[PDB]
Amino acid sequence: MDPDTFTFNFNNDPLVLRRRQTYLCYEVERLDNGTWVLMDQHMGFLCNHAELRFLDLVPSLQLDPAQIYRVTWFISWSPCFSWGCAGEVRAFLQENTHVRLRIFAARIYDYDPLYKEALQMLRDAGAQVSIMTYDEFEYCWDTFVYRQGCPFQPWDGLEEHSQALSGRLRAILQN
């Protein structure tokens, strides 16, 4: 991914909620022995509902049923419900029991009126959902962003907005 768009579509400032476009940064980790192992070939990102795009790409990702895998979503927006994305994600994890999903949402897609239900069923699907903190943002910047050596420059109010979103999400899941 080129820069100047990771910062734009991964900023969690509520004043930046004006423009929407899902970007799902994905990576797969294999449970070798007892430690997850990352490989460079399966590292990548998607653009815009990116969730399904990834659900369609995961059959053709050299999946091995014998070895259980775990995939982490560094998605810009939280998965939505009325468009059905939470439904397909739950269905995919309902039958494919050898894959664990990690979701790191930079923002909560509250644009969908059913976002709380989407997050609740994602939690019920065995996939834990969280909100990106500074370390996830810098990991995304130095992993999926073509930085060409430039360090990660935080935006204003990253910590406060991240904490607020994390509190909202943890209040949603506890119900």
Partner: protein
């Protein structure tokens, strides 16, 4: 181009004499609009080309270019545009100085494109949230396409039935700045990040210890005197014990406490404030020994010299909040002493939109389509009476004050404020709180156009009717928005609204224009659905958005001729043009208390005194005491002196 030089010279020659010539300032506005005609965008395509950097990815404008062009061209020839252009020189000057955005190329946005931008931002937010669209369709069962949403917002904004806040009018869709005009915080001294913004800030500095910003402090503070006399305004959340002890036994002695210990006076209020205050004075923790008469006279003198001190009754502000607040009590308001939220835990904001009540007159032309009074589609607003039967006077330009288009304006203002809250809040906590302040403007214009004085009994009845009806409409619309968005403000449960409460329950001698059976239905629907907003009605001075509309300043009488200093022959026929100073201040305070039960937040109540009784410094004290006796929240915002 020799026309522009002539235009500018005529602009000067007409605006120099525009104060005493009502026909010249309109001509000045027309000539100023003509002068800037070629310097502003003429077509929607040109508007999107000049401001492409703010609209290259705005889906609504890009996919509705043609329909927007058709509607804007219709608006340009519409009588609403002629009314806007003929609003005077000040209106055009404010448009071309503040509201109309300027791009890189220097081509400013036109008035028609400005209202297009506002209505398009609102329509895009509604269609983009998919819950505001559903709420609007349920509340307006004639809107199907998104372009009809734009039509709704465009007619309600161009007709100026909804007078949006200055930050909303300035940065709706063109900047990522905060759209919340009022910000209030009570830090544990964060605040610096909001001083760099362009919104008013209200700071509670009671805990200090021993843009425009308003500082609020309780009178029992150790440095209350140093705070009274010193860019920055002054606020006094006066406890009820102050007014009690000043009213009877004025010789009694007030006590000051430093915030180092201060007991729990700042935290709590009410009867237990009296118990805690007296327990503290019996425990010998008081740093001050100042007589209450001296403190009251000092406050009155500092108010008459300058409108710096704001007097707000702590009991009325706190005990009428939708939460208990008995344990922890707010002590800070906004810049204009009309927004009341707790602000210790997090920064609290408020998004404001005014309703020009002269646009609610039956004979006043509106850009709103005639086929919108019907098909209203809310079961709690079809049953409400209209035309507001109050027997207008003989010299009445208005013919009834429909009072149904007032509810339509309140609905559209509620939806506009919902859009502003959702797309312009600076923090998620403020976004979830969804604090809405719906003020009014032109109330004096309504009373004059109906041939009454501000004090006349029909004026008081219409005042109570207006504020009750707009509060009811705001409640119903917020409940619908919360139901269809499932964004209920966090503290709605175990609150007053969740059990049945409407902020007029806790007042004495309140007469409702609603039969108390529709209030019960509203309570039932609020209980079973919730409320999107936590605060609904808050009376803003709205000195800026009123200029471009010509509506009178907020709910105040005329104060900005010499009707009093005019012969008796031309005095009874123009008696309805009496200035706010001419009216008895007791009557104004009584009307403020009459409208208070239906204003959930505070109201910027200002006292108007002449230089014959303000210098006495005893009439203002009696006014404040009797405002206490009526339970007003904002006892005094500005002590206007002429």
């Amino acid at each position: 181009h020799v026309e522009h030089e002539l235009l500018s010279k005529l602009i000067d020659e007409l605006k120099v004499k525009a104060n005493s010539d009502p026909e010249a300032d309109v001509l000045a506005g027309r000539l100023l609009h003509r002068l800037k005609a070629e310097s502003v965008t003429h077509t929607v395509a040109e508007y999107l080309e000049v401001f492409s950097d703010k609209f290259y990815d705005e889906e609504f404008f890009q996919m509705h270019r043609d329909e927007l062009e058709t509607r804007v061209s219709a608006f340009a020839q519409s009588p609403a545009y002629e009314r806007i252009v003929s609003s005077g020189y000040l209106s055009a000057l404010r448009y071309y100085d503040t509201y109309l955005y300027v791009g890189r190329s220097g081509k400013q946005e036109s008035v028609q494109h400005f209202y297009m931008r506002l209505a398009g931002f609102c329509a895009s937010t509604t269609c983009l949230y998919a819950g505001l669209r559903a709420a609007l369709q349920r509340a307006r069962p004639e809107i199907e396409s998104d372009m009809e949403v734009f039509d709704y917002y465009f007619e309600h904004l161009t007709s100026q039935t909804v007078c949006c806040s200055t930050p909303f009018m300035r940065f709706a869709g063109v900047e990522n700045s905060t759209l919340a005009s009022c910000i209030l915080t009570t830090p544990d001294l964060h605040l610096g990040r909001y001083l760099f913004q362009r919104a008013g800030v209200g700071v509670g500095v009671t805990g200090a210890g021993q843009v425009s910003v308003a500082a609020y402090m309780e009178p029992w503070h150790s440095q209350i005197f140093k705070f009274l006399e010193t860019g920055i305004f002054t606020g006094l959340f006066v406890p009820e014990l102050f007014f009690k002890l000043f009213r009877d036994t004025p010789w009694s002695d007030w006590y000051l406490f430093d915030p180092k210990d201060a007991g729990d006076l700042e935290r709590l209020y009410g009867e237990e404030f009296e118990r805690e205050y007296y327990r503290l004075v019996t425990a010998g923790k008081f740093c001050g020994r100042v007589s209450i008469k001296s403190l009251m006279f000092s406050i009155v003198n500092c108010a008459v010299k300058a409108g710096s001190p704001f007097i707000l009754l702590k009991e009325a502000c706190n005990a009428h909040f939708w939460r208990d607040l008995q344990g922890e009590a707010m002590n800070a308001a906004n810049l204009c002493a009309e927004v009341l939220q707790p602000s210790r835990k997090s920064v609290a904001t408020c998004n404001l939109a005014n309703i020009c009540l002269p646009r609610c007159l039956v004979n006043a032309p509106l850009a709103v389509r005639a086929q919108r009074a019907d098909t209203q589609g809310d079961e709690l607003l079809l049953a409400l009476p209209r035309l507001s039967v109050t027997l207008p006077g003989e010299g009445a330009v208005g013919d009834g004050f429909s009072l149904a288009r007032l509810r339509d304006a309140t609905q559209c203002a509620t939806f506009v404020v919902a859009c502003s809250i959702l797309q312009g809040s600076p923090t998620y906590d403020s976004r979830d709180m969804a604090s809405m302040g719906l003020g009014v403007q032109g109330l004096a214009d309504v009373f004059a156009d109906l041939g009454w004085q501000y004090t006349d009994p029909p004026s008081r009845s219409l005042n109570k009717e207006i504020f009750e009806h707009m509060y009811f409409t705001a409640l119903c619309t917020s409940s619908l928005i919360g139901l269809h968005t499932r964004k209920i403000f966090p503290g709605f449960k175990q609150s007053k609204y969740a059990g049945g409460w409407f902020h007029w329950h806790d007042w004495a001698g309140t007469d409702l224009s609603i039969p108390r059976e529709i209030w019960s239905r509203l309570s039932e629907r609020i209980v079973r659905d919730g409320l999107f907003n936590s605060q609904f009605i808050a009376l803003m001075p709205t000195s800026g958005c009123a200029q471009v509309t010509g509506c009178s300043d907020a709910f105040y009488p005329f104060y900005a001729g010499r009707v009093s200093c005019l012969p008796e022959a031309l005095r009874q026929r123009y008696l309805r043009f009496q200035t706010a100073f001419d009216y008895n201040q007791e009557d104004l305070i009584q009307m403020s208390r009459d409208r208070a039960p239906f204003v959930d937040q505070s109201q910027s109540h200002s006292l108007f005194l002449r230089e014959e009784d303000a210098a006495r410094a005893s009439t203002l004290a009696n006014l404040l005491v009797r405002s206490y006796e009526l339970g007003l929240k904002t006892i005094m915002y500005y002590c206007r002196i002429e």
